[PDB]
């Protein structure tokens, strides 16, 4: 009774857990009440219960601080009971742990403990370990003496002592600065998939022994360097408790014949002795490259040695082998056959939300000024991975240290806690770091759920509805499609003038569907054409299959024709290497994988007609320049982010901008805003954009689509009926 499954929490606070209301009613506790949690090895913790809309009924959400004190791990089950008789304490004694008090001195109580407890009203228990962050350090403390027992709430009027040497960490507890799941920012969906594959075989092996099902024995993670492939593998081992063995290709490959095989085989034998265990092999493509791509005896044999060691995992109880590579196709295909490494996860590049999450994780210890805006940084850090975002946090800290701290402290290993806590990092320090850092994964395609919604698109009311019918209905109402024998379309192509919202349309439908958006641009199709590397098309479509549900957007479909001369070219046809592989993958893609393909072009007259046949991009939507009411809607939408003066006549502007595209109306709105900002700045050397700013902006803005192009687009659309 009163048993709940331990899982991760959204609320990071050291005294807060979250329950779903049905359990709060059965336990007869209310929001804000204090409860006791009973874990393992006669260990207990005291906390406050809140509620949210994310915790499931059978789970209790708690952070690492609570799980460590209870000596429990994710996937375990604990008992919960209310304790309404909790009162305030009188005197407590709290001391830091030596594991974190290194390179630091001074009055750690005034810097850490007193801000932590003062007006905090936190419930504590004797022996509780908790982490206090600040001054770019994370210091954990233990409660060693209390007058009340076994728990109390620490009020601002209580006496807190902190005298004595730092306490050595006990073997029954883990350091709170160790790598866990809360250290992983982006790619959280991928971590969830891995947890489902790994947590249960290791946490509850009795269920897999008793039930006729087979556990995964090998998971391949792939993506650019610096995305967290090695961070995930270690975090999983730390959270589950499995022994972590580290292997890397270059080291094993550097060894001579007989040495590389012995070292690789030994690591597997050690994992069995230390089972449950996880073996992580980094740079899998280096330790086991494709045999058909090498010539040496050592390279051919070491691949065979790994292949047989992986098969041996049927006898090595509770051993899971993880591996990391840059590309799933850079390793010997035998590794990916049934068994061995039969599971793979696409880590890729963190999305806009994940990048912010990573910046927030690597600033937990940093004291930030009020002007610091990590969301703005995350939006500008395109192409950056966790390794680069962590670099930004360290570099911004170094700028604060060289300005202030290096004028205070000596050339030594010890700094006073007060000096560290007095140091804050400003927006100028993050801006400097941003200009110095260079993304390590800017060339690879980034896949993410877009933030564009339907409210961001002016006009095109019928096109927005059309995409909902093409993408949402086939999966929201599948019984109607079966009833009438409907065959969903696999994709749609947009054509017409540039700058009318084609990109927003593809993103907006992906947004509402909560589907991943894969953006492929002309330069990618041009590179494949000129480099005779059309095989990369298959990887693009394969990502769409693994990222499903997703929308796969192929922009600038005309770029293939341009590569061969475009308007003139040679005497051949429209078919070529790149488009042929694209058509092949399209025909081999089923609507059952919830992948919808969208194309776009500004030159539909030179698109290989094959792509428009039934089964491909059979649907054609014309996106003309916005009409009178749409241009007003576009101007109004772009101004949602700033106050607009009552003298601004949006209809007058739309009447003048008869030949303008949506992209050009945006420049007018943005220019008028910048002009209003310029005046605002000057007034301090204004609260809204005035009519004068729009009229001035009209003097610089021009239409991007000429009258000759408009007639060409309209005549083409008319020809198609």
């Amino acid at each position: 009774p009163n048993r709940l499954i331990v899982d991760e929490a959204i609320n990071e606070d050291n005294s807060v857990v979250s329950l779903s209301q049905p359990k709060m009613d059965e336990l007869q506790l209310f929001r804000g009440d204090t409860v006791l949690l009973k874990g393992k090895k006669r260990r207990e913790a005291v906390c406050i219960v809140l509620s949210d809309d994310t915790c499931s009924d059978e789970k209790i959400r708690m952070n690492r601080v609570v799980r460590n004190n209870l000596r429990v791990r994710l996937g375990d089950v604990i008992s919960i009971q209310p304790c309404p008789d909790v009162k305030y304490g009188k005197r407590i004694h709290v001391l830091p742990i030596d594991d974190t008090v290194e390179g630091i001195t001074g009055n750690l109580f005034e810097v850490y403990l007193k801000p932590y407890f003062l007006e905090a009203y936190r419930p504590i228990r004797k022996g509780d370990i908790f982490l206090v962050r600040g001054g770019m350090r994370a210091v954990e403390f233990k409660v060693v003496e209390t007058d009340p027992s076994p728990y109390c709430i620490v009020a601002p009027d209580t006496v807190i002592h902190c005298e004595g040497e730092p306490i050595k960490r006990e073997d029954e507890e883990e350091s709170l600065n160790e790598v866990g799941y809360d250290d992983i920012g982006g790619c959280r969906k991928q971590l969830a998939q891995i947890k489902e594959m790994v947590e249960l075989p290791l946490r509850h092996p009795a269920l897999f022994k008793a039930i006729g099902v087979k556990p995964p024995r090998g998971i391949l993670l792939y993506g650019p360097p610096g995305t967290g492939k090695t961070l995930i593998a270690r975090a999983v081992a730390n959270e589950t408790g499995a022994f972590f063995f580290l292997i890397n290709g270059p080291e094993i490959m550097s060894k001579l014949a007989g040495e590389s095989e012995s070292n690789l085989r030994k690591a597997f034998e050690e994992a069995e002795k230390n089972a449950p265990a996880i073996i992580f092999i980094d740079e899998l493509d280096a330790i086991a490259p494709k045999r058909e791509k090498t010539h040496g005896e050592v390279e051919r044999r070491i691949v065979s040695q790994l292949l047989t060691l992986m098969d041996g995992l049927k006898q090595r109880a509770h051993v899971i082998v993880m591996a990391a590579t840059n590309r799933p196709n850079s390793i010997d295909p035998a590794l990916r056959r049934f068994g061995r490494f039969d599971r793979e996860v696409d880590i890729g590049i963190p999305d806009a939300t994940g990048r912010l999450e990573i910046l927030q994780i690597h600033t937990k210890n940093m004291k930030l000024a009020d002007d610091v805006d990590l969301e703005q940084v995350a939006n500008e850090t395109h192409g950056h991975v966790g390794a680069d975002l962590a670099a930004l946090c360290s570099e911004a800290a170094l700028q604060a240290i060289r300005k202030k701290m290096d004028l205070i402290d000596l050339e030594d290993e010890t700094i006073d806690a007060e000096v560290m806590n007095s140091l804050a990092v400003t927006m100028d320090d993050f801006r400097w770091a941003l200009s110095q850092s260079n993304p390590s994964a800017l060339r690879e395609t980034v896949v993410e759920v877009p933030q564009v919604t339907w409210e961001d698109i002016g006009g095109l009311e019928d096109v927005k509805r059309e995409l909902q019918e093409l993408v949402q209905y086939p999966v929201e109402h599948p019984d109607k499609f079966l009833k009438f024998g409907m065959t969903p379309s696999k994709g749609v192509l947009f054509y017409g003038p540039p700058g009318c919202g084609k990109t927003l349309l593809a993103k907006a439908i992906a947004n509402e569907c909560q589907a991943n958006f894969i953006s492929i641009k002309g330069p990618e199709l041009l590179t494949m054409w000129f480099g005779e590397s059309e095989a990369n098309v298959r990887e693009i479509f394969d990502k769409a299959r693994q990222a499903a549900p997703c929308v796969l957007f192929f922009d600038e479909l005309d770029s293939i024709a341009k590569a061969r001369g475009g308007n003139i070219g040679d005497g051949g046809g429209a078919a070529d290497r790149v488009i042929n592989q694209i058509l092949t993958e399209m025909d081999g893609m089923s609507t059952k994988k919830n992948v919808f393909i969208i194309g776009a072009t500004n030159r539909p007259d030179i698109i290989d007609p094959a792509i428009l046949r039934p089964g491909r991009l059979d649907q054609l939507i014309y996106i003309p320049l916005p009409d009178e009411k749409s241009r007003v809607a576009i101007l109004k939408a772009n101004l949602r982010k700033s106050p607009v003066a009552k003298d601004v006549d949006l209809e007058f502007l739309a009447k003048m901008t008869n030949g303008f595209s949506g992209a050009d109306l945006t420049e007018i709105c943005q220019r008028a805003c910048k002009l209003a900002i310029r005046e605002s700045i000057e007034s301090e050397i204004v609260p809204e954009i005035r009519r004068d700013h729009f009229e001035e902006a009209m003097r610089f803005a021009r239409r991007s689509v000429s009258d000759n192009d408009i007639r060409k687009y309209e005549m083409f659309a008319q020809t198609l009926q």
């Binding site: 406050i48 809140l50 009203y121 936190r122 419930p123 709430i153």
Partner: peptide
């Protein structure tokens, strides 16, 4: 009881100020 509700008000204020 009342000391627990004051602990909840302090913990909730910390979470909302940092998360919002």
């Amino acid at each position: 009881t009342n000391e627990a509700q004051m602990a909840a008000a302090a913990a909730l204020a910390r979470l909302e100020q940092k998360q919002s």
